[PDB]
């Protein structure tokens with residue numbers, strides 16, 4: 143039992159926040175006291191106010207908070223079995239979820255490794271790729287290649303494939319693996335980009351295990367969109383030069399970009415795939431790494447005899463149960479129409495933002511809207527403005543942006559876009 | 572899905588920990604329920620009740636489906652499943668942080684929440700790396716530890732795992748090269764600590780931290796060592812200006828007979844990891860704590876921040892069940908409970924010492940180990956335990972248990988009886 147003022151006091155003294163300091167925070171965190179549907183209840187000047195979760199709590203809350211069907215699946219599982227070890231045991235929530243994932247991901251992804259976060263599923267993906275080649279008698283193939291602008295997590299391997307300015311930084315000179323970086327992938331399709339990619343890959347091929355990318359949308363590294371055709375070229379390059387392809391769909395997964403997985407826009411399958419975030423409907427942390435039967439059987443027949451990974455809470459029944467229900471809920475409705483409407487709503491609402499002085503781009507892709515400005519967005523100016531409009535927004539760098547819950551009404555998208563348009567206008571001043 | 576369908580979906584599509592696809596020497600057993608210290612498993616088409624002797628890998632200290640913890644979870648679920656921790660704070664996080672700073676070794680004032688043990692370990696290393704960068708000494712970037720340890724499966728965590736291992740020979744070259752002192756022995760030996768100091772001395776300018784599991788090394792070999800070694804480590808680290816990190820992910824929350832295993836020695840590390848028992852085994856959550864000084868040095872550094880922030884950082888649901896699990900631990904006489912467990916483990920396992928294939932028997936708090944003279948065949952051990960109403964998971968040459976704190980004396984006796992019978996079968 144703590145009051146909002148007591149929460150603030152404990153938090154200031156004792157809580158780290160994402161990429162934050164202790165005792166140097168420019169502004170106090172705001173107290174969140176509830177979340178229901180698309181709305182959060184927050185304390186502002188000692189008063190609870192309801193505001194739209196424009197960001198879906200970082201891509202996670204696809205059906206909104208406290209969706210009756212998701213709450214119900216969680217409590218139904220809670221009464222039967224909270225958790226058992228996954229060593230020598232299996233269970234229904236893991237089986238059901240693995241079943242759904244293999245059916246609905248791009249063709250050929252036949253096996254599923256559960257883990258407890260996105261960064262962990264990325265390191266598992268890398269470990270699959272590395273063990274793969276050792277199982278082929280090619281231990282020299284151990285480096286990773288990616289393109290700039292990417293983000294794959296904060297654990298040390300994951301960091302090595304993050305954008306070097308995204309934070310490498312300079313700050314981590316050594317201690318990171320030195321990976322192969324291609325230039326930023328452009329928005330519009332240019333065959334010259336893919337040709338230069340291939341030439342660069344070609345000369346490293348004998349030391350490359352895999353290419354790892356976010357398909358179609360790069361999220362936390364700067365909300366950039368690229369033509370799906372590039373993914374088709376990667377698949378092609380990777381096949382021809384014998385390098386595995388990893389798609390990191392932790393942010394792009396489960397309908398967000400207008401296809402079920404963004405790889406579907408290109409009609410391509412990677413060899414290894416990561417999912418997370420929206421997987422659980424934003425209730426709990428869970429992730430999965432899927433790989434082809436070939437990858438699975440090469441690992442298993444290699445010297446180690448096994449994938450050498452296994453978190454304590456692997457395949458947690460509670461996480462797997464709420465995920466099963468989150469996935470069925472998406473699939474049981476006309477999700478494609480929902481996303482199309484959302485995209486249209488975002489496009490319409492954000493439109494007037496391009497005629498603003500500080501704004502260099504306005505872009506929409508599925509249920510994702512971005513306003514790019516020509517300077518950093520001042521958080522101590524931006525946050526106040528959006529709160530006043532009943533919206534929780536979180537700009538970073540020069541980007542005002544949103545990934546709203548799938549359940550947002552036209553009135554709610556209008557309200558989100560209007561606060562975004564306003565954040566951009568104040569940037570101009 | 573029926574159990575048969577679960578088996579079918581599983582063998583086709585599910586990776587298990589440290590497992591193959593399609594080459595599993597044994598099928599997994601379907602688990603369909605868990606209540607208190609008991610699992611309901613399907614064996615030959617029939618549900619059977621078995622004791623969770625391992626506490627689902629150290630996690631289920633209060634057993635499964637404890638009413639206080641179920642209710643803490645459903646209460647949070649009613650109010651707020653999850654919000655982003657960037658720009659926002661909430662009551663579950665504050666309550667759990669308040670609790671953790673109060674009960675951990677003195678001087679651990681700040682709390683970084685993550686989603687798993689391996690992450691919290693990488694967070695600990697990052698903290699140490701950023702600390703020395705903030706002091707203008709970016710050369711202090713290597714880690715040192717002793718052999719026999721385990722800190723997780725992510726790539727940095729792996730670098731401080733015992734090299735034989737999981738499994739540096741097959742890895743290395745992608746693993747950062749850390750400094751390894753010899754295996755810490757069971758009984759106190761001053762010459763061991765003198766040599767540790769001497770080895771650390773010649774790497775001091777490149778070491779960010781010593782990282783160890785205190786008192787009990789879990790997944791690396793279920794080895795115990797004298798807590799005075801931790802006193803030596805704290806002294807060495809202070810004199811040579813290397814941070815000290817205790818990985819208490821397995822040892823935390825009462826399990827070794829003190830609240831935290833660092834307490835057996837009265838030592839405070841600079842950085843500490845907790846996990847597993849933290850949530851009472853309901854959900855994955857972990858935490859990394861460090862001193863105010865480590866926090867301030869990082870925060871005044873070039874970065875001006877600790878450069879980590881998982882999507883689900885400080886998840887309300889996971890924090891809420893954790894708050895309830897810790898409070899349930901503190902609101903009972905846990906110390907007497909663990910002593911009773913230990914006495915019961917020792918009494919029940921005494922008989923294994925005489926067995927032909929047993930090389931050692933050891934207990935430390937609610938942890939019991941029969942060390943055998945050959946690796947244990949799971950195809951023999953598993954049905955043998957199941958025939959006695961117990962879920963045991965041996966590894967390497969070890970038959971061992973870390974039972975839920977709620978186990979009655981008869982249940983502890985049933986567990987140890989099964990362990991003894993597994994050990995008798997190994998010897999043949």
Ligand SMILES: CC1=C(O)/C(=C\N=N\C(=O)c2ccncc2)C(COP(=O)(O)O)=CN1
Pocket residue numbers: 229452453454455588628687688689690692721722723724784789790818819820821822846
């Ligand atoms: C002291 C210590 C640990 O014991 C662990 C993990 N322990 N893992 C198990 O006990 C285990 C054993 C066998 N199979 C799966 C997990 C970890 C890793 O935590 P995580 O496996 O990521 O949740 C870090 N520090």
Ligand SMILES: CC1=C(O)/C(=C\N=N\C(=O)c2ccncc2)C(COP(=O)(O)O)=CN1
Pocket residue numbers: 160200259260261262264293294295296356361362390391392393418657880881882883
């Ligand atoms: C594509 C992709 C990811 O987007 C992420 C994490 N995304 N993080 C956030 O969006 C985020 C944003 C702002 N602050 C903290 C995290 C990760 C890492 O996930 P994790 O943070 O370890 O659960 C891996 N792949």
